Design brief:
The structure is a homodimer. With about 325 residues, chain A is α/β, with parallel strands linked by helices. Chain A has 2 domains: about 220 residues, NAD(P)-binding Rossmann-like Domain (Rossmann fold); about 90 residues, Alpha-Beta Complex (UDP-galactose 4-epimerase, domain 1), CATH 3.90.25. Chain A contains 11 helices and 13 strands. The first copy, chain A, has a 6-stranded parallel sheet, sandwiched between helices. Chain A has a 3-stranded mixed sheet with strand order 11-8-13. A two-stranded parallel ribbon of chain A has the order 6-9. Chains A and B meet through helix 4 and helix 5 of A and helix 4 and helix 5 of B. The structure holds NADPH dihydro-nicotinamide-adenine-dinucleotide phosphate (NDP) (2 copies). The site of one NADPH dihydro-nicotinamide-adenine-dinucleotide phosphate has 24 residues of chain A, from helix 1 and strand 6. Chains A, B: Its EC number is 1.1.1.271. Chains A, B: It is an enzyme of class 1 (oxidoreductase). Chains A, B: It catalyses: GDP-beta-L-fucose + NADP(+) = GDP-4-dehydro-alpha-D-rhamnose + NADPH + H(+).
Chain lengths: ~325, ~325
């Protein structure tokens, strides 16, 4: 029976992985809250790995946030993520944990990357200013993995998710992420019976979204693949695997679908006097598909269930 | 009287900065050996910054090495450099040290960068495989600086040196760096009276070199410039300053000059059946020059004095 440590098990991604691993007895979960184990503390992390007998590690702990947070607390974002990654990865190795899965992000790719973005797009150009510090920390996390794999013969794998959504996401009004922000706005516009909801931009840009449960499934799939199969589909210095749907849709389609899911009867209006972001942004998931994994949750279905979750948990936001 | 902490004061770059700051009483030096203070230990570093009253920090501590070391111990190179940087920069901030100078490297630029390499060449393309882990750690160091500057209003500056040479360099036979490797080989070829010295490649590629004392001078200059002057010549997210001569010379010219300096009478032979590296590699030092600093040590002069140092210290290698 495999003893698995899921760092940051309370977070959106961490909890989703936990929900799926709890549903099987061939695995025993070792979990620690931030109050029980501060991941920024090197000594505490080594002590923990030394006392417990960990077989696998899902590194889902991170200092995450929206556009405002990333530009407001850049030092906290680069520093904390760098320490958490370093502490866990090095402690794991020091205590003979050979298997580890690092969760990156798609913000890591160059701002002007070629679409769809293949894994080799990594470090091919300048990063988006807003995400720069966070992105550098994450890229460092991947390189730490590859370096321990190369030097010590470890099996530290990494997955790069596209935009995620689902339960436990940040539905607070401060969150800039489009899905939870729109679910909230349309929910309230529906409740207050507002004639219209104005969204900035033309609605023409295309984005990719993946439900968090699909994310967790792909993660566990990649974690559990045969080492030989993984080595065969990756390179020692280009080892990360993109995780997404490979399907993009316009913001207009997204807003319109959310309106329907929520039961909003007003008008969805796009104010084109405001600028759009990049025209298109999606991952090339060829590598993942060849590894035999395909997503199961469609946008409409995922938005419906997530809204359902938001309804039962709204007295938290 | 300014209290200055020079991390890694025993190293090549660290010691050069120390030699120049020791030669002035308006500064008081706080130094700690690796045995006195382990920079990888977070608690020890915070304790030190808490006990001492540091005004400035020259971050010259690093896990450095040649081609063999970087490819043999990649994990040690990325991990140690990331921890040392993180620990010092965060501890400094936590204890109100507002001034800090971070020493990067030119290995940090993309493999296929445009020559000469301006500071904006950073993160514009893939890194040299050999230096990848080290390079990522260093880039992270720069971004840590910029992030603390942005968030907390700190004054953490950074300089990017070209290839360095001078006393305290690694003259061991294991060192791959061209200058100390050639000084050693020509020294021995001269002593054993070998008819020739064969060097791999055509000798046509061009490289830039800067004596370590010039390096230290430029560093101290950049550290002591007026904050307004520095802000005026840099950008918050493109703040590093290239440090070099801006002059390149062929490997052939380099080997021939070393032969002369050492008094070698044999033949210098280039074996063109072996591959060359990139054709040209040098820094654009426009930004540094506009800051009013210019190098003083020429190649012939620097090679002569360095050889002199090697002679008085050969019973160490
Ligand atoms: N969020 C998103 O939109 C998606 C995320 N990703 C990837 O998923 C990763 C996880 O994101 P997500 O689940 O949404 O974020 P969450 O903030 O929900 O998860 C982070 C978790 O880590 C814990 N944590 C942070 N610092 C510490 C610490 N010092 N000690 C102990 N625990 C700590 C947090 O606990 P607490 O809250 O108690 O402090 C939290 O439970 C990201 O880093 C990113 O790489 C990719 C695309 C999108
Ligand atoms: N070397 C070169 O060719 C040039 C270097 N640079 C830049 O200069 C920087 C310094 O390089 P250089 O002076 O040549 O290297 P050195 O190895 O001579 O300097 C590193 C110093 O840091 C100390 N150190 C390392 N780890 C620790 C630790 N954990 N605790 C305490 N002290 C520690 C080392 O001490 P000890 O030896 O006692 O362990 C050593 O004295 C580089 O990182 C690079 O960014 C740029 C271009 C070229």
């Amino acid at each position: 029976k495999q003893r698995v440590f899921i760092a940051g098990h309370r977070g959106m991604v961490g909890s989703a992985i936990r929900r799926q691993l709890e549903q099987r007895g061939d695995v025993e979960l070792v979990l620690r809250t931030r109050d029980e184990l501060n991941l920024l503390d090197s000594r505490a992390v080594h002590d923990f790995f030394a006392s417990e007998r960990i077989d696998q590690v899902y590194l889902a702990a991170a200092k995450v946030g929206g556009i405002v947070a990333n530009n407001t607390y850049p030092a906290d974002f680069i520093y904390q993520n760098m320490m958490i990654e370093s502490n866990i990865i090095h402690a794991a190795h020091q205590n003979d944990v050979n298997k580890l899965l690092f969760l990156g992000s798609s913000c890591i790719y160059p701002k002007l990357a070629k679409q769809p973005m293949a894994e080799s797009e990594l470090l091919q150009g300048t990063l988006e200013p807003t995400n720069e510090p966070y992105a550098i920390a994450k890229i460092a996390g991947i390189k730490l993995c590859e370096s321990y794999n190369r030097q010590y013969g470890r099996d530290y794998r990494s997955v790069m998710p596209t935009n995620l959504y689902g339960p436990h996401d940040n539905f607070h009004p401060s969150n800039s992420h489009v899905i939870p922000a729109l679910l909230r706005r349309f929910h309230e516009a529906t409740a207050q019976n507002a004639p219209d909801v104005v969204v900035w931009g033309s609605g023409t840009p295309m984005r990719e979204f993946l439900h968090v449960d699909d994310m967790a499934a792909a993660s566990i799939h990649v974690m559990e693949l045969a080492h030989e199969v993984w080595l065969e589909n990756t390179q020692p210095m280009l080892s990360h695997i993109n995780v997404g749907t490979g399907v993009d849709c316009t913001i207009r389609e997204l807003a319109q679908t959310i309106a329907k899911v929520v039961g909003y009867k007003g008008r969805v209006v796009f104010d084109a006097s405001k600028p759009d972001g990049t025209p298109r942004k999606l991952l090339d998931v060829t590598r993942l598909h060849q590894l035999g994994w395909y997503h199961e949750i469609s946008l409409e279905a995922g938005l419906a269930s997530t809204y359902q979750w938001f309804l039962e948990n709204q007295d938290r936001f």
